[PDB]
Amino acid sequence: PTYTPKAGDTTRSWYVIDASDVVLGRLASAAATLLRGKHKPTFTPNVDGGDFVIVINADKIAVSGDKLTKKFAYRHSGYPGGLRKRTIGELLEKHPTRVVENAIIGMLPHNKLGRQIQKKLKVYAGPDHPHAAQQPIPFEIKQVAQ
Amino acid sequence: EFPSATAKARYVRVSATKARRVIDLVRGKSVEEALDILRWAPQAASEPVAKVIASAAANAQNNEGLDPSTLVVATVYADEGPTAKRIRPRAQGRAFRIRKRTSHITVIVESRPP
Amino acid sequence: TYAIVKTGGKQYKVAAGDVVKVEKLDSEPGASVSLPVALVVDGANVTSKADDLAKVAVTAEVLEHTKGPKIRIHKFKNKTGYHKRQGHRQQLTVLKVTGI
Amino acid sequence: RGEVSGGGKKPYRQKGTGRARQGSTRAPQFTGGGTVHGPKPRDYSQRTPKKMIAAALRGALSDRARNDRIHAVTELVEGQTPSTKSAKTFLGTLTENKKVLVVIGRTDEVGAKSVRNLPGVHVISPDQLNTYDVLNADDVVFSVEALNAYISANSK
Amino acid sequence: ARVKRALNAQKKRRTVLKASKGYRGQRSRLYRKAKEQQLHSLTYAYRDRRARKGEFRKLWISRINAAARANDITYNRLIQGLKAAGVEVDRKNLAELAVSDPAAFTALVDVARAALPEDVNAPS
Amino acid sequence: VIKLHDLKPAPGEKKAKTRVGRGEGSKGKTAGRGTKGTKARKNVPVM
Amino acid sequence: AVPKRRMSRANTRSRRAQWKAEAPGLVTVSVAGQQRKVPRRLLKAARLGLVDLD
RNA sequence: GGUGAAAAGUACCCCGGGAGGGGAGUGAAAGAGUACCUGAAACCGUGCGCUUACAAUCCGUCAGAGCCCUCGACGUGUCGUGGGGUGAUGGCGUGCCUUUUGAAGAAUGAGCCUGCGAGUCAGGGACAUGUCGCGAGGUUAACCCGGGUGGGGUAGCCGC
RNA sequence: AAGUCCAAGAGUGCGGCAGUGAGACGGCGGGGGAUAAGCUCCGUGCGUCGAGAGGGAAACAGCCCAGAUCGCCGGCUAAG
RNA sequence: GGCAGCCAACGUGUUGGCUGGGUAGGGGAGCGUCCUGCAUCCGGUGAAGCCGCCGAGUGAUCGAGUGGUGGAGGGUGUGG
Numbered sequence A: 001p002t003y004t005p006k007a008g009d010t011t012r013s014w015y016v017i018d019a020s021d022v023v024l025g026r027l028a029s030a031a032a033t034l035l036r037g038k039h040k041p042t043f044t045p046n047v048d049g050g051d052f053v054i055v056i057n058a059d060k061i062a063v064s065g066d067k068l069t070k071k072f073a074y075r076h077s078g079y080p081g082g083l084r085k086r087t088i089g090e091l092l093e094k095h096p097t098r099v100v101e102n103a104i105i106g107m108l109p110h111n112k113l114g115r116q117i118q119k120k121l122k123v124y125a126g127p128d129h130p131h132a133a134q135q136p137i138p139f140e141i142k143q144v145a146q
Numbered sequence B: 001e002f003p004s005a006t007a008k009a010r011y012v013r014v015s016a017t018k019a020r021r022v023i024d025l026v027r028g029k030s031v032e033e034a035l036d037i038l039r040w041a042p043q044a045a046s047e048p049v050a051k052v053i054a055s056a057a058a059n060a061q062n063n064e065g066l067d068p069s070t071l072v073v074a075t076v077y078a079d080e081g082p083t084a085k086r087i088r089p090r091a092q093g094r095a096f097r098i099r100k101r102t103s104h105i106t107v108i109v110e111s112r113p114p
Numbered sequence C: 001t002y003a004i005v006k007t008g009g010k011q012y013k014v015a016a017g018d019v020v021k022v023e024k025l026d027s028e029p030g031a032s033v034s035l036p037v038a039l040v041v042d043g044a045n046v047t048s049k050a051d052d053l054a055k056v057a058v059t060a061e062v063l064e065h066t067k068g069p070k071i072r073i074h075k076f077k078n079k080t081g082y083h084k085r086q087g088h089r090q091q092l093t094v095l096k097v098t099g100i
Numbered sequence D: 001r002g003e004v005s006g007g008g009k010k011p012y013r014q015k016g017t018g019r020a021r022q023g024s025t026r027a028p029q030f031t032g033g034g035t036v037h038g039p040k041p042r043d044y045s046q047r048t049p050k051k052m053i054a055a056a057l058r059g060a061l062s063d064r065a066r067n068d069r070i071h072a073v074t075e076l077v078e079g080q081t082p083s084t085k086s087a088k089t090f091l092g093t094l095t096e097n098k099k100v101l102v103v104i105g106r107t108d109e110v111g112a113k114s115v116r117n118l119p120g121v122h123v124i125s126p127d128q129l130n131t132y133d134v135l136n137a138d139d140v141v142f143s144v145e146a147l148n149a150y151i152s153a154n155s156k
Numbered sequence E: 001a002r003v004k005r006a007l008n009a010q011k012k013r014r015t016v017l018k019a020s021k022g023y024r025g026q027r028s029r030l031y032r033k034a035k036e037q038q039l040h041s042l043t044y045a046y047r048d049r050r051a052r053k054g055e056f057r058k059l060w061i062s063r064i065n066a067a068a069r070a071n072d073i074t075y076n077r078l079i080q081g082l083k084a085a086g087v088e089v090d091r092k093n094l095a096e097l098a099v100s101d102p103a104a105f106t107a108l109v110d111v112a113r114a115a116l117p118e119d120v121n122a123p124s
Numbered sequence F: 001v002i003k004l005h006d007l008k009p010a011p012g013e014k015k016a017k018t019r020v021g022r023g024e025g026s027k028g029k030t031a032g033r034g035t036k037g038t039k040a041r042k043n044v045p046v047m
Numbered sequence G: 001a002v003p004k005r006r007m008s009r010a011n012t013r014s015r016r017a018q019w020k021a022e023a024p025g026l027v028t029v030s031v032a033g034q035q036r037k038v039p040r041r042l043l044k045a046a047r048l049g050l051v052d053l054d
Numbered sequence H: 001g002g003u004g005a006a007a008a009g010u011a012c013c014c015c016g017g018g019a020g021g022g023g024a025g026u027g028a029a030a031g032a033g034u035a036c037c038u039g040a041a042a043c044c045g046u047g048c049g050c051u052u053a054c055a056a057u058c059c060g061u062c063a064g065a066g067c068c069c070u071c072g073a074c075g076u077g078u079c080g081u082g083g084g085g086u087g088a089u090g091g092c093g094u095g096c097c098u099u100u101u102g103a104a105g106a107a108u109g110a111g112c113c114u115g116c117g118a119g120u121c122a123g124g125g126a127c128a129u130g131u132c133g134c135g136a137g138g139u140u141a142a143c144c145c146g147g148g149u150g151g152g153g154u155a156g157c158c159g160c
Numbered sequence I: 001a002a003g004u005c006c007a008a009g010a011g012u013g014c015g016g017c018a019g020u021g022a023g024a025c026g027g028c029g030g031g032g033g034a035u036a037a038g039c040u041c042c043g044u045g046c047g048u049c050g051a052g053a054g055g056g057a058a059a060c061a062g063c064c065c066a067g068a069u070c071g072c073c074g075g076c077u078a079a080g
Numbered sequence J: 001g002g003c004a005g006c007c008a009a010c011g012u013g014u015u016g017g018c019u020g021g022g023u024a025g026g027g028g029a030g031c032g033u034c035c036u037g038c039a040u041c042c043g044g045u046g047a048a049g050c051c052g053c054c055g056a057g058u059g060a061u062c063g064a065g066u067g068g069u070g071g072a073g074g075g076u077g078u079g080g
Helices: A024-036 A088-094 A096-107 A112-118 B016-023 B031-040 B046-062 D050-066 D084-094 D109-116 D131-136 D144-155 E007-020 E031-070 E075-085 E091-100 E102-115 G009-016 G040-047
Strands: A014-018 A052-056 A072-076 A083-087 B004-012 B071-080 B084-089 B095-100 B103-111 C002-007 C010-014 C019-023 C032-042 C045-047 C057-077 C082-099 D070-073 D100-103 D121-124 D139-143 G026-030 G035-039
Touching: A014 A024, A024 A052, A024 A096, A024 A112, A052 A096, A072 A088, A072 A096, A083 A088, A088 A096, A096 A112, B004 B046, B004 B071, B016 B046, B016 B071, B016 B103, B031 B046, B031 B071, B031 G026, B031 G035, B046 B071, B046 B103, C002 C019, C002 C057, C002 C082, C010 C019, C010 E091, C019 C057, C032 C082, C032 E091, C032 E102, C045 E102, C057 E031, D050 D070, D050 D131, D050 D139, D070 D084, D070 D144, D084 D109, D084 D139, D100 D109, D100 D131, D100 D144, D109 D121, D121 D131, D139 D144, E007 E031, E031 E075, E031 E091, E031 E102, E075 E102, E091 E102, G026 G040, G035 G040
Parallel strands: A014 A052, D070 D139, D100 D121, D100 D139
Antiparallel strands: A072 A083, B004 B103, B071 B103, B084 B095, C002 C010, C002 C032, C019 C082, C032 C045, C032 C057, C057 C082, G026 G035
């Protein structure tokens, strides 16, 4: 039978990704790939076999076009007329980590395992992060050419 | 297995659910503590339960020759018994069914070490 | 050393003494079957060329012929009255690989 | 549902009661109601052609004669007083099989009574000789008169 | 000949309830409601027996692609190269190698890259 | 010898009655009558 | 209104578990030499001999 | 409707006001206690194992960690051609019947279980096919004789 | 004239038994309508659903691919 | 790799080629029930029934395989 990850088989590493000047979609796609564990040959979709990702410089993320002012993050409170909307620029100004984190959880699966995966996304807006004690590995987003 | 005594009060005129409501207060407790709780429990279904438990303890002391102080209500449960069907007349001459429910209360007390 | 044997239309990674259930074979229990290989790996060397693989054959003893799990098909279409009950027990051969 | 007692009246209104439409408390679905397609007295006898009946009997007798299962006898016991012990002894000396069809004449009441009480021994008259009897019996014991009567009635 | 519908009737009921042992609520207790879930149960069993092959192939492809990226090659170019090299190892066993013996998978990656065309994008 | 337990009908002499209305496997539900209509509950006369 | 559907046994059980009796808190009292257990509210009555301790 | 073969239907102990029970006895059996053969399901408990209080579930199915038991092995506790319980998690997934162009349908019926509940029967009926018998013939109806199926019955019927 | 021809499981005739005789949508040709309708009425060796699962159209009988005899934890592809 | 329907070949049933979605419906072959002719076999050394266990069949279903309760009738073959 195909290999199934047993109890003591999921080893998680720590990757730190610098968000400065990186496209939001690229950063979020690669972060979601790492968080899911699509980069591990032991991948199993029913297991959280992914790696912790620490996004830094989340405030200096790069977007394109007018998305910084014409793309809205919406939230409904449930109360009638309770639709708040905040452009990506406003969201970067107020909660810089928000934009990037919302993108990454968007690209993650929407289920119990997805929300257990989210816990490994430690996004930070400053150039510094607190997890230096993890020896996070720098991770550049590279494309495997053909 | 600790020595044990049984006692089955059968066809008690109390709904099995109401007998259970008072059984849960005592299951697993010492016999003395169970009897005190049943004595001070408002639920009228407590008197049949207390009598079953006291009968179990009495059977333990006499028929089994066990020390009463070492007895605890090991397994006590109330099962449904035969239901009598009565008729309650209602408005527009419609007859509803009343259920006079009974219960079989079984108590099994064990002589556990101090 | 392990070989990815081809037997019964499927491929199985085996090593000396590994037991695999495969499709049925026309060999009595206790008989030996030589099965072609899709790839052998000896520790570090990997024989991938079909030319060098056609000369290596995995020998396996037939321990027995078994019947797989009982599949219970009940084809059903609603608002149709179409039920079709059916069963299956795939005939399989259990092989113990003697060596490569 | 028309033969079971009562059930003439429509049990309740057609509409308004919230219950299924019933036209009788004796309808088939009702407990205590009438059987829909239950049995009625039947005459299962079948008008089988005379030649078919006779050929079946001749075939059964032929099978017995081929297997040497047909015996003949001048008398069953001796005459006058029936004797089951004597008849059983004689049928034992004849045939060891269990089922025996004694084709005996109507007038041999002695032999009829004597052999009557043996367990596996049917007694039939030559004119009533039938397939079922011959086939059921392992052997067929004819009184000489019975055999002659059967042969005469058939060759005629 | 009045026949009671009891000996015969209970056989399928016991069968369906035995099969439904494990279902939640009525679907495990009532024969009628168990039968409704058993129809769907075997419809799903058939569907998922036939889709299990595809979903395991999907898992194998995911793992082979993971190992291919680790070995710095794309999955589709890896498959192209394996086909050109004549390596007839299926995706099941390729993923098995990816997980257990990454050196063997790196060997096969080298084989596939070697057998790839000098230019993959050239019309050829 | 031939016996009552050896007697059998001729090959193809007897045919199994068709039990109509017994489950969907055989002629089930409508019992070979199709959906609604006159012929679903009565036989239309020949004339 | 009327219940539109039979309540699942899980929901029935979960709501029915809430119909339970609270165990009375029993305090020791000395009456006639032997020790008895009575609610702290009836503690004064037991001391004054006003409680029928069977 | 059904205790048991027989009432042998619990002389006398204990808890309880009683009911009822526990002893002890009868009995082959009390897993037969006048609530009584067998004792199904629905339904209601209790005990144990797993599982669940961040979760959106036609309640399953397919993969499936973990945990709990079982059969072997080796005789280290780990592996197996294993088996069973539970099911974290992931994929897929729109009840049954009827009736419809089309229903998961917010169309109908069904609260649940058990039991019952629907193409049957008569007729030398009609047609068509199967199969036997006899065959240019084939059958006999009523009826008569047979404690039975069996033997007669040439009137008629269909062939011609 | 060939092809298909260990089959289309063809055509025709005569018999036993039917069910159907409420169709839907899509393409094309048209009528009625406003050259509206998911409208209505026709034609179409046109298709599909009806009575068709599987993949794709997100979900989505009728659209595209493709017609499920069963089992594989094999492979190549269709639409996408 | 298994099964089934048609067909062919030769045999004295093997192979091969095709074909096996399906509602109304048609045809074929079967499972199970209890009642019986006959024949056999099981049963107070424990029948049926019911509850399981271990399994079995291409289906309905099956266990003259087994354990618990049970207490008296059952199974099989072949026909009606």
